[PDB]
């Protein structure tokens, strides 16, 4: 996560608010001063130094973590960005449109913007390239794994923060006293933009015994809950048949149409797109719009604020309308009891914010504040006619103190307990702390209980016994968190392999079409999803698609979901193929691959290096998260459950499951445990609270935490 944040996310944050334009009006009392000046400061490429420290007397030298721990320094490195100053001027002729030109003062020029704390053993740290003898020379323990920050000489670990996944439609049954029976909400969030969270709630009024059960949705920046038909007509879908086609995908599902009948009756008197937009414009919360501009205000709200995770550009009203219809369809499916309400505790519906995303959002806030200060100083200099000093414009202490304060104290802002002092009682205690996850807690769910989806991702018995029981979780041994990839290549690939776009999709002519979702965004439909899923799986198993990408085919409700976002917890699994030579399902990994692995391992203690990525690229293993785990069948043991079927009475009773359609096999079942639970001898012979007590108490033992 830290390497992703340093290598890619920093430039993305810089390029999001790169250009800072200041326009100076002529303010001309006489026509002799009819010139308007346009000053632009633009941030370019960002540079990072090796970790280093500047002392009192101004000398800057390389800082190593041993010195930074001893001298109570911060193991940080400098950030430098390229700034090009643009000066545009134009003749201020009233009525005539201004055409600016450069005065050739395009000065450019690395400028120091702050110190980013460097997590140890990351790509920027000195200890990444260090050998064992180099680590001994630097008085660093070779057993030390890194993974932490040094802030003021304290080893700070960033606890992974668990949050609900974004861009997922979740339908919730409200309480009996509430007039709203069901609520379908989506926490619509975007990654390549302002990172603002806009929640669209589609709500179904009236209880089951009631008759006037209408559906009203909570658009952002709107004081009232607009009926869904008015929103559909405001999106350009006037007739009732097209609206019901967008919502109900089966013409024979008359019960869904019967529940939609009060909704179309409610917004019956609005029959035009402009009337619907002006109706939305009446309820605008800004309250500064004149009589005639409410149409454009409603269009602007529907474009830049209504479901921003799909698009922010114009001309995408059809996709937003189809997604709104999909939300209403899911809401009515739960309302008709065809599907249960969404499980809040499903671990596939969760994301874990590691050091990467946490430092990313913190640096986004700090850099927005820094750009605001740059513009404020620049406006002061151009208004009060003082000379512009480049060094006073960028206050590097802003970014430096923000990162240092949010890492030294756990308060993630300007959420507590994000950064904790790293445990150093034993080695296993440090390992357990570096894989610890935290779930902030006031909802109606049950997050403290161990869920089914927690299999192989978090430890079944490793949690504190106090008030943090179940809220604080520890990763299993093989579990990994995805760092996130760009969904644009996958979306481009899908549209060139038969995915019909959502603009020219009609559900009644394509009743068997499978909806295609990429990162929670409905991008279109596919007529033949089976061979598409086969193509996608063959690309991922050969490494063409990044192995962290999770692709889920839900055959029952005809959905193909692809997730490329960060924060997904996955685990490796063996691949079980058809294997027509043996006539039965078998693991793709064979004894030759195992021999290559042991040959590489014993060479490390001259043949080709056969690494874990060699298994990953040859399709022998695969990365499965909790969403994809819902659509696969896993065998616990290869040699016991793959081949088709006197027993030792001392052995435990095993079931063969009487089913040979396996798609995956567990690598080893002992890998469902975390660091502290893997110390326990025979944990399967113990009562589970005793395993939890030992996992808590293994961190309080005495050993040799580090050799240095």
């Amino acid at each position: 996560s830290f390497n992703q944040f340093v290598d890619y996310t920093l430039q993305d944050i810089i390029c999001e608010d790169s250009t800072l334009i200041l326009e100076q009006l002529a303010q001309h009392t006489t026509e002799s001063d009819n010139i308007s000046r346009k000053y632009e400061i633009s941030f370019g490429k960002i540079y990072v130094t090796k970790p280093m420290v500047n002392e009192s007397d101004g000398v800057t030298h390389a800082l190593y973590p041993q010195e930074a721990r001893l001298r109570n320094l911060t193991y940080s490195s400098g950030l430098f960005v390229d700034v090009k100053k643009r000066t545009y001027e134009a003749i201020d002729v009233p009525g005539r449109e201004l055409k600016y030109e450069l005065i050739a003062e395009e000065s450019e020029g690395k400028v120091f913007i702050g110190r980013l704390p460097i997590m140890l053993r990351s790509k920027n740290c000195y200890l990444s390239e260090a050998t064992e003898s180099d680590l001994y020379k630097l008085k660093e323990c070779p057993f030390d794994m890194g993974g932490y920050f040094i802030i003021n000489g304290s080893e700070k670990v960033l606890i992974a923060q668990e949050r609900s996944a974004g861009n997922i439609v979740q339908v919730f049954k409200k309480a009996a006293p509430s007039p709203i029976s069901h609520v379908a909400e989506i926490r619509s969030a975007l990654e390549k933009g302002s990172r603002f969270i806009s929640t669209l709630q589609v709500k179904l009024y009236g209880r089951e015994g009631s008759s006037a059960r209408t559906i009203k949705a909570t658009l952002p920046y709107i004081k009232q809950d607009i009926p869904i038909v008015i929103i559909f007509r405001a999106l350009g879908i006037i007739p009732d048949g097209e609206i019901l086609e967008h919502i109900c995908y089966d013409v024979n599902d008359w019960q869904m149409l019967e529940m939609l009948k009060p909704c179309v009756e409610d917004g019956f008197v609005i029959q035009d797109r402009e009337t619907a937009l002006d109706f939305i414009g009446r309820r605008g919360t800004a309250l500064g719009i004149k009589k005639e501009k409410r149409i454009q205000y409603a269009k602007d709200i529907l474009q830049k604020e209504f479901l921003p995770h799909i698009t922010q550009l114009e001309g995408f009203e059809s996709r937003k309308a189809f997604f709104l219809g999909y939300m209403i369809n899911r809401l009515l499916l739960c309302a008709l009891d065809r599907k249960d309400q969404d499980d809040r505790d499903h671990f596939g519906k969760k994301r874990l914010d590691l050091a990467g995303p946490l430092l990313a959002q913190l640096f986004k806030t700090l850099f927005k504040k820094l750009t605001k200060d740059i513009f404020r100083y620049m406006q002061r200099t151009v208004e009060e006619a003082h000379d512009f000093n480049m060094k006073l414009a960028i206050n590097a202490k802003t970014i430096t103190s923000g990162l240092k304060y949010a890492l030294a104290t756990g308060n993630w802002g300007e959420r507590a307990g994000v950064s904790q002092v790293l445990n150093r009682y034993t080695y296993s205690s440090t390992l357990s702390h570096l894989r610890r996850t935290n779930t902030p807690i006031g909802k109606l769910a049950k997050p403290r209980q161990l869920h089914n989806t927690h299999w192989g991702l978090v430890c079944p018995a490793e949690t504190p016994e106090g008030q943090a029981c179940g809220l604080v979780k520890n990763l299993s041994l093989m579990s990994c968190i995805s760092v996130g990839t760009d969904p644009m290549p996958i979306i481009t690939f899908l549209s060139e392999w038969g995915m019909e776009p959502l603009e020219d999709y009609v559900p009644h002519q394509s009743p068997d079409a499978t909806r295609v979702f990429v990162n929670g965004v409905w991008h279109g439909v596919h007529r033949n999803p089976a061979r598409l899923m086969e193509t996608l799986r063959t690309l991922r198993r050969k490494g063409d698609i990044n192995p962290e990408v999770s692709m889920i085919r839900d055959i029952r409700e005809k959905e193909l979901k692809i997730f490329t976002d960060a924060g997904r917890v996955y685990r490796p699994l063996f691949i079980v193929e058809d294997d027509e030579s043996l006539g039965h399902k078998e693991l793709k990994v064979r004894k030759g691959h195992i021999a290559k692995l042991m040959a590489t391992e014993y060479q490390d203690i001259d043949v080709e290096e056969y690494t874990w990525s060699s298994l990953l690229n040859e399709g022998l293993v695969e990365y499965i998260d909790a969403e994809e785990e819902e659509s696969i069948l896993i065998a616990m043991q290869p040699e016991d459950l793959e081949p088709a079927e006197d027993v030792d009475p001392a052995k435990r009773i095993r079931v063969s499951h009487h089913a040979t359609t396996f798609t995956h096999c567990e690598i080893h079942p002992s890998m469902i445990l975390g660091v502290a639970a893997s110390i326990i001898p025979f944990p399967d012979h113990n009562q589970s609270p005793r395993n939890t007590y030992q996992s808590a108490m293994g961190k309080q033992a005495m050993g040799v935490f580090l050799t240095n």
């Binding site: 002092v421 504190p464 016994e465 106090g466 808590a696 108490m697 309080q700």
Partner: peptide, 24 residues
């Protein structure tokens, strides 16, 4: 300060539970 995982119950400290339900 201290950092211990052995949970010691804070006695005489029901005000956390009193403040959880202040209205009836």
């Amino acid at each position: 300060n201290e950092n211990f995982e052995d949970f010691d119950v804070e006695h005489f400290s029901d005000e956390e539970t009193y403040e959880e339900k202040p209205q009836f």
